[PDB]
Structure formats: C-alpha cells, structure tokens
C-alpha cells in the first residue's frame, strides 16, 4: 500500500492522539462556556495610541495598559450602531466564543467591558499586520509559504469543528500575522455552534461555498471550501472566482469549474479540486475520514503537524517589528474621539455583555 508498517503505525497513533487532545479541549471549552468572564477592566486603565482598523463594526485601537505597560488591540463598538445594524446577537456571540476558546492560532481576549455608549473587547495586539496586506504587496506566496499558513488554518478548523463551531469568515483580511510569523484568527461574529446544519446567508462573496449561495442548509464543510479558496488565493495572488459584481462571482462558484495558474504544482491542484468540490458528498473535510483526508494529502506530506501546533517550525516570513507598540504593519486611519454619553444606551439589549 502507500504506507509501510512503521509509517502506518505512526500515522494511526498520531490520529488517535489528535482525538485525545480534542476530547480534552472540548471539555475545557464547555466548562468555560458554562461559566464565562465579564467586566474585567475599564477605559481609563489604558492609554489610547492609534487607530489600527475600522469598519461598520466600529474601530480597533492600539492601547497601552497603564499598570503593566502591555499593548493591546481594543475593539470599540457603538451600542446604538450595533443595534441599528442588527448585530446584537453576533456581537454577544463573538465575545462568548472568544472568552471560551483556547488555541495557539486564535486571538486571545484579555479584557472586556462596556460603558453608557460602547462595548470594548481588549485582545492581544498582533503586530505583524493582515495577511491581506502582505499578500497584495508580495503578490503571491510560494507553495511552502502558503502551506505553512494553510496548516495553521487546518489545525484551527480541526479544533473549532470539534467544538461544533463553524467559522464562516475565512479570508486574508481576517488573518493577522504575529511577531513570530504565525497566524492569528480574530473575528468570530459570524461563527456559530452548529452540530448539524444552519441556513444563514453570510460571508464574503469570493469565499462563499456553493451551498450557501444556493440557499441550502449547510454544515462545517463550508469552512473547508473556504480553505480551498484561501490556499488558492495565497498561492496565485488572486482568488479562484472573481468578477466585477458578486452575482457573477456566484455563477462561477456554483459552476463546478476552476482554473489554475501554470505554476501550481499537481499536488496543489489535486488538493484544491477536492476542497473546491461543489458536491458536498465528495468534498474533502466532509467525508468519513474527516480532516485526515486533508492532513494526509500529498501537498501536506512535508508538514509536521505537531511541530506547527507547537510553533517550532521556522516561519517563512517574519514581519518587521521595531518594538512593542510598533504599528507600521497596519494602515493609517483618521483619529476620532470616543465619546461616552451621560445616558446609558441599549442597556437591555447588551445586558449579558
């Protein structure tokens, strides 16, 4: 067969050890989910430094904790705006997930709190920038470089899916690079506990699985489709399905056709055809052998999965870092006040935050 006796035994043992790790991690997650944390700091405990990111969600600021000198990324959400945009459940869900998970590639929430006007989630500052920026600047990542990042996503999804969490938000924009060159996943607003199926239309056009577009019930396999999109985009420099407008993107996604750059290896194309598989019955990550079809694929043959988890692999790329509080790997944004009203807003809606 493909493996001789020693390799087959080693692989089997490794796969059983994964099961043992995940069972313990699920026990720990459920204990923390039952009994969270809350109101663990306040605004005047931090110095505001610079805005690192913005969106309809609100803003993320680099802050420095006054007592410890530690830098953090503080996400600030305007409660009234969260309500107007119908994001109450997503915001509460994001905090509850972040509070309960623990994995080397998932950003750590250190504090959370709220005032009359805003919600605050204070996370570890990830100083290396967005994968998106590096990808657009470099153009494309070599297959080994793409593989290093892809392996981290595979392990992260293996973890999240064991907790029955579907991620639903994968894209280079949502992946940050830490000081050692490893990935941090950060955005959990669209993540959901789904042991079975779910139905919400959500995600980013280029990364949507066909069954989402086609308004079907869907499952964790959408994350494996999205991994295929990510690997393709990392290795090509552009995603597999693009067009001027989302509707035309969706027509390409559902077609069952994908084309590859001539520089893609045959191993990469084989993996991608099995991830970018329209037929759920055939998609890698959704078959009887689960995540193992991906981890044992030829394209990952050089990947030492435990060494990646342990962060013992030398990263192919280390972002520039001049010291704590270096913001140079992020863009510049207009600095705006953070006003907090003398009147509590939306207390009932956010009572559990």
């Amino acid at each position: 067969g493909h493996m001789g006796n020693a390799a087959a035994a080693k692989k089997g043992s490794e796969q059983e050890s994964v099961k043992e790790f995940l069972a313990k991690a699920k026990e720990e997650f459920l204990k923390k989910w039952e009994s969270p944390s809350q109101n663990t700091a306040q605004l005047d405990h931090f110095d505001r430094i610079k805005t690192l990111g913005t969106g309809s969600f609100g803003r993320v600021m680099l802050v420095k904790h006054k007592e410890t000198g530690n830098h953090y990324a503080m996400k600030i959400l305007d409660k009234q705006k969260v309500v107007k945009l119908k994001q109450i459940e997503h915001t509460l869900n994001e905090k509850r997930i972040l509070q309960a998970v623990n994995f080397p590639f998932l950003v750590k929430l250190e504090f959370s709190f709220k005032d009359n006007s805003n919600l605050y989630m204070v996370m570890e500052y990830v100083p290396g920038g967005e994968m998106f920026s590096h990808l657009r600047r470099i153009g494309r990542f070599s297959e080994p470089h793409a593989r290093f990042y892809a392996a981290q996503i595979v392990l992260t999804f293996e973890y999240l899916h064991s907790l029955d969490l579907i991620y639903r938000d994968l894209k280079p924009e949502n992946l940050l690079i830490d000081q050692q060159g490893y990935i941090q996943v950060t955005d959990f607003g669209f993540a959901k506990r789904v042991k079975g199926r779910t139905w919400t239309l959500c995600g980013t056009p280029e990364y949507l699985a066909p069954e989402i577009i086609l308004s079907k019930g869907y499952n964790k396999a959408v994350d494996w489709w999205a991994l295929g999109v990510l690997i393709y985009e990392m290795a090509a420099g552009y995603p597999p399905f693009f067009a001027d407008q989302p509707i035309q993107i969706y027509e390409k996604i559902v077609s069952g056709k994908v084309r590859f750059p001539s520089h893609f290896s045959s191993d990469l194309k084989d993996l991608l055809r099995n991830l970018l598989q329209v037929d759920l019955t055939k998609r890698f990550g959704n078959l009887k052998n689960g995540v193992n079809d991906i981890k044992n694929h030829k394209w990952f043959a050089t990947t030492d999965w435990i060494a990646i988890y342990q962060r013992k692999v030398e990263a192919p790329f280390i972002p520039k870092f001049k010291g704590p509080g270096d913001t140079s790997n992020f863009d510049d944004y207009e600095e705006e006040e953070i006003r907090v009203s003398i009147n509590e807003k939306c207390g009932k809606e956010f009572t559990e935050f």
């Binding site: 969106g55 309809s56 945009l85 994001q87 998106f132 657009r136 938000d169 894209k171 924009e173 669209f190 239309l201 959500c202 995600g203 980013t204 056009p205 280029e206 420099g237 552009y238 693009f242 067009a243 001027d244 084309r259 750059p261």
Partner: peptide
C-alpha cells in the same frame, strides 16, 4: 492574463462581508 482580469474586476482591495 488572469492577473489582468483580476485587476480589471476592481475587487483587489479589502472585501466586505455580505451584511455590509
């Protein structure tokens, strides 16, 4: 080229999710 088609799409910047 396919790269030129990507540039022509106008979707080379940060992409928003559907709900935006």
């Amino acid at each position: 080229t396919t790269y030129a088609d990507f540039i022509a799409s106008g979707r080379t910047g940060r992409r928003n999710a559907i709900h935006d």
